[PDB]
């Protein structure tokens, strides 16, 4: 889940898919989850997620030897479009610092 | 017998599969069981349509074709749903045999029409249009006798 609770994302295969959380106060519907997006930039399976402190970027790690950063909304797509290469093996984690300057 | 020994048998000709590489000929009841199918009947009527179109219908073929057709009608004479599946095939081939010039193929169609009308009671308008198609190309004398 996001820190602000309203979205969740998951690493299904090699797609990072973000859905948005149904309310607890609402009644049960036939389809309560409404899809936000599904991003595909990794080539092999994604091993980890990490949300930023503000629920604004998400940083995913893959078996493919990279890690990627994705903005949640489309307007900040230029702030988060980089990929992080250089590891010899599976990237097991990718985290922000407290101020979201170091990764 | 020779073409059955060397043939690779199509799936519509399935009942001849116990007479391939055999010393005895297929029998007439095997020929009626071959003709009794509906897809085989559509296939053979298309073959006759090409025969009638290119004007190659010869009297031994017309005799064999008419014999197997009236035996199909005789075999299906006790189930009306098979007769009703069978009517727009053999009446269509009767129309296409009446729409040619051969006296032999015209009286072949006369034989098919007379056996089929005595096998089931057809409609009045079908019988009238059948006699119109009979008279609309009547040119011979043996054809006039049969007509």
């Amino acid at each position: 889940f996001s820190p602000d609770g309203r979205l969740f994302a998951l690493a299904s295969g090699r797609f990072l898919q973000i859905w948005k959380t149904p309310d607890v106060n609402k009644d049960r519907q036939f389809a309560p989850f409404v899809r936000h997006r599904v991003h595909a930039g990794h080539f092999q399976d994604i091993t980890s997620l990490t949300w930023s402190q503000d629920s604004r970027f998400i940083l995913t790690t893959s078996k493919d030897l990279s890690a990627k950063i994705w903005s949640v909304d489309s307007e900040e797509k230029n702030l988060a479009a980089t990929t992080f290469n250089g590891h010899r093996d599976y990237v097991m984690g990718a985290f922000f610092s407290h101020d979201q300057e170091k990764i | 017998k020779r073409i059955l020994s060397i043939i690779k048998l199509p799936p519509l000709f399935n009942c001849l599969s116990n007479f391939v590489r055999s010393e005895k000929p297929p029998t007439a009841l095997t020929m009626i069981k071959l003709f009794n199918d509906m897809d085989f009947l559509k296939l053979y009527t298309s073959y006759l349509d090409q025969c009638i179109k290119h004007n190659a219908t010869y009297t031994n073929q017309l005799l064999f074709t008419t014999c197997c057709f009236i035996n199909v009608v005789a075999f299906n004479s006790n189930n009306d749903e098979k007769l009703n599946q069978l009517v727009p095939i053999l009446l269509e081939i009767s129309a296409k045999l009446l729409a040619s010039k051969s006296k032999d193929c015209q009286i072949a169609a006369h034989t098919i029409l007379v056996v089929f009308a005595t096998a089931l009671p057809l409609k009045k308008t079908i019988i009238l249009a059948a006699m119109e198609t009979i008279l609309s190309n009547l040119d011979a004398k043996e054809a006039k006798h049969s007509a």
Binding site: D27, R28, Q29, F30, A31, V34, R35 | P10, P11, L12, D39, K42, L43, S46, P88, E92
Partner: protein, 358 residues
């Protein structure tokens, strides 16, 4: 009255109600969106699985629904709703009080015919967006030009034109200039259905007496006529996989198949749906495919497939009859009794007045 214990969830067991469904094609797969009262339901045509159910019940019954690639356009009482994945994306209020009852979508245009013989054209704002959203113009079919609008279609390669099928006439509008380009001659009996052929500039018209006309919309003539005596024609579909067959659908529940090339009648599926519930209400070939999806008002949606021909040299003349493939269905009459089959709330037994236990 709103409740405080129980809140409505779904109405299960419903597949169709005899609104003519729409087919849509994502990529190379097909979906089938059928109306069930006030919701629609999207089905996966390769296996008839329920993909989507529309999210909210409309305030009245859905009466005309179409489907382009990702979007489903459902017309109920006054307005047209544009839906993606069930969740409604847009709502087009018409400026009338007349009930919208037909629609077509081509280009940047959505065209919705009401029942006072007016047609409302809606336009995209910029040709890159997803659905037509802004009001453009209004067209009117007055009593001089034609009767009640019985269908509304766009046959292909016709640059921003619209074939309007009235009960007696066929009009052709230019929907950018708002003009009436061509009005055909009259037809001696009331035409009920229309379907555009995959032949260029040919539409197929189905009358209330038994005949299918093959109108050539550029010559203004009719190409051919097919007569099915004492049968009201409720569906028309064309086969598009190198076999020129037509499938007509008759309101006594029959699906008749014609070869147009050699002018014969391939086969008749009799009692494919109940006449009392409407007969075969929509039958359509999934294009490029030998499978045809029918649906009737008896809460049933079937698929029929053509097997390849049994003669290895002729083929085109020995056409194997259509056989049955998957189908979904429910009760055709309202259920009379209800029980739960197990403690897990997974299955429930349900008996109806049409004498079936589902």
């Amino acid at each position: 009255k709103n409740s405080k214990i129980f809140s409505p969830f779904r109405i299960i067991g419903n597949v169709s109600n005899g609104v003519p469904f729409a087919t849509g094609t994502l990529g190379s797969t097909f979906y089938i969106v059928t109306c069930v009262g006030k919701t629609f339901q999207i089905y996966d045509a390769n296996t008839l699985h329920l993909l989507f159910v529309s999210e909210k019940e409309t305030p009245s019954s859905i009466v005309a629904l179409s489907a382009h690639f990702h979007y489903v356009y459902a017309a109920y009482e006054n307005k047209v709703g544009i839906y993606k994945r069930g969740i409604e994306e847009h709502l087009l209020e018409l400026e009338t009080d007349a009930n919208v009852e037909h629609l077509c979508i081509f280009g940047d245009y959505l065209c919705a015919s009401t029942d006072d013989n007016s047609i409302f054209i809606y336009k995209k704002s910029d040709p890159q967006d997803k659905y037509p959203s802004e009001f453009y113009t209004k067209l009117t079919v007055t009593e001089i030009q034609g009767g009640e609008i019985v269908s509304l279609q766009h046959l292909a390669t016709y640059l921003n034109k619209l074939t309007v099928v009235t009960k007696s006439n066929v009009l052709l509008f230019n929907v950018r200039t708002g003009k009436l380009v061509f009005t055909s001659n009259e037809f001696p009996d009331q035409i009920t259905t229309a379907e555009p052929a995959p032949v260029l500039d040919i539409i197929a018209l189905g009358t209330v007496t038994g005949e299918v006309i093959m109108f050539n919309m550029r010559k203004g003539k009719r190409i051919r006529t097919i007569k099915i005596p004492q049968s009201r024609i409720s569906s028309l579909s064309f086969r598009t996989d190198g076999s020129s067959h037509l499938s007509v659908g008759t309101s006594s529940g029959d699906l008749i198949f014609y070869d147009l090339d050699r002018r014969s009648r391939i086969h008749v599926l009799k009692n494919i749906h109940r006449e009392s519930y409407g007969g075969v209400t929509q039958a359509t070939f999934l294009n490029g495919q030998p499978i045809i999806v029918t649906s009737g008002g008896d809460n049933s949606l079937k698929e029929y497939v053509f097997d390849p021909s049994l003669s290895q040299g002729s083929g085109d003349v020995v056409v194997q009859p259509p056989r049955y493939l998957r189908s979904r269905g429910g009760h055709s009459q309202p259920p009379s009794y209800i029980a739960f089959a197990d403690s897990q709330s997974h299955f429930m037994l349900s008996a109806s007045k049409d004498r079936s236990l589902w």
